[PDB]
Design a protein around this ligand. Structure first.
Ligand code: CG8
Ligand code: CG8
Ligand code: CL
Ligand code: CL
Ligand code: CL
Ligand code: CL
Ligand code: LI
Ligand code: LI
Lengths: 263, 263
């Protein structure tokens, strides 16, 4: 049959996808800006398709309910045929790979620690050995799941701490985690993807820091329904953009070129 | 039909694959040791296959001759059906991805600069602006091809330099490049994958250094013939090993645990 407009699912999160300040004046894909908006356009240009940016209905990345077996988030939108491609900071994981197709990574990263400047923490081991400085993750997504599923002693100890700590150490959004770091006088540290940590470190009021090595090493991938023909072309596009240096330029544009915390 | 032993192609290069010191006493897969030997065993264990380690006949990674259209190296062994899987420090590239299947990365890396300690170079830009300190790459493989194909001004200038420099700045093997750094009194710098640079930095006589940021960001993948059923299971195995922390442990074992240059 004839070509059809490709339905892209994504999620609103700076600096990946944001409504432009003047979005009310605009329409369609032009309402949005950010790293993933630019990446979507570069992929579509290379592959020769038209597309529509849509925002994932449930605000989630993708997990399977153990009782109902239903997939939520952007993964679910692909699994159930509601979108044709997901272009987002979506971590490549085994359980997701079993149900959807992923490109090779477009961005490499790991779980990391964000502190308020001056907090006496340098590593996950440091966090794990104490409770005065509380620490936690988002309440959904791959960072939380890393701790929940880990069999590594330090990370298992951290998960047991997080489930039992009071008040709750979990946050609903990145903005909430960052605000909690900023407002807690050194008594909250936030575990989050290194990408995001690096972005926030260059935002005013310039009071957060990434510390320590990353806890793991993984990647974000472009996702398509399992077996979709679009997958091959999108994957080749990711590889081409990487080989041309364009992914590095795009990260610099959205993270550093207009950083707010000096040179 | 019945299961058959899987033919693995790999290449002899420390610390990935080496003949054990006592190899003459041994037989079969047990003759070999190293990171990729251990990785092959972990993949086979997870997937439930028996396998035979073989060494790529032509000593190459994989490129296509522009005139004959023939693929060489480990890629060629897969393309032409001489091996079932390649388990090696084989870079995921667009042109290879078009002809073989790749797992998600098992190791992330980039092109990097190796200097003899004390050489006054900190970046690729520094190299590109001068000729007193000669610099080059292997004479085959993805590092050379990065420069040959680059449209980025600094790297294109470096390629033009490398093709025209005398005496030849290219080397046939990693060992030759390292020896040339070590013997050239600061007048040769070697461009090589960061993985390898990091390994050599922890080898006696402890006279080399990795300097500067990496020039690119890519990955090694396990490769199979295009469409081979083995690909899905191998890819899931890579993801599982990564998620369990085993790939990090394996790098530490072969790079750092017995490093020769201090703690
Ligand atoms: C906006 N980012 C920051 C962030 C994200 N995720 C989702 C994850 N990439 C997934 O795919 O589930 C996390 O799990 N931890 C984080 O710190 C998404
Ligand atoms: C043993 N390593 C070191 C090294 C290798 N390669 C081959 C490359 N991974 C490929 O797949 O062509 C390079 O191109 N540059 C290097 O410095 C393999
Ligand atoms: Cl349409
Ligand atoms: Cl917004
Ligand atoms: Cl057999
Ligand atoms: Cl050997
Ligand atoms: Li998949
Ligand atoms: Li491929």
């Amino acid at each position: 049959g004839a070509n059809k407009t490709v339905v892209v699912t994504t999620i609103l999160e700076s600096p990946y996808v944001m409504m432009k300040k003047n979005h009310e004046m605009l329409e369609g894909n032009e309402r949005y800006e950010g790293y993933c908006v630019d990446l979507a356009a570069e992929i579509a240009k290379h592959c020769g398709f038209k597309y529509k940016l849509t925002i994932v209905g449930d605000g989630k990345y993708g997990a399977r309910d153990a009782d109902t077996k239903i997939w939520n988030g952007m993964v679910g939108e692909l699994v159930y045929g509601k979108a044709d491609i997901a272009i987002a900071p979506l971590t490549i994981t085994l359980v997701r790979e079993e149900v959807i197709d992923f490109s090779k990574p477009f961005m490499s990263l790991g779980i990391s620690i964000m502190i308020k400047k001056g907090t006496p923490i340098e590593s996950a081991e440091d966090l794990s050995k104490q409770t005065e400085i509380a620490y936690g993750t988002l309440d959904s997504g791959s960072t939380k799941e890393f701790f929940r599923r880990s069999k590594i002693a330090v990370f298992d100890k951290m998960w047991t701490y997080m489930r039992s700590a009071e008040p709750s150490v979990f946050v609903r959004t990145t903005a909430e985690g960052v605000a909690r770091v900023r407002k807690s006088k050194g008594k909250y540290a936030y575990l989050l993807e290194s990408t995001m940590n690096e972005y926030i470190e260059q935002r005013k009021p310039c009071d957060t820091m990434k510390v320590g090595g990353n806890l793991d090493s993984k990647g974000y991938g472009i996702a398509t329904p399992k077996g979709s023909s679009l997958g091959n072309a999108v994957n080749l596009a990711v590889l081409k953009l990487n080989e041309q240096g364009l992914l590095d330029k795009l990260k610099n544009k959205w993270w550093y070129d207009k950083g707010e915390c000096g040179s």
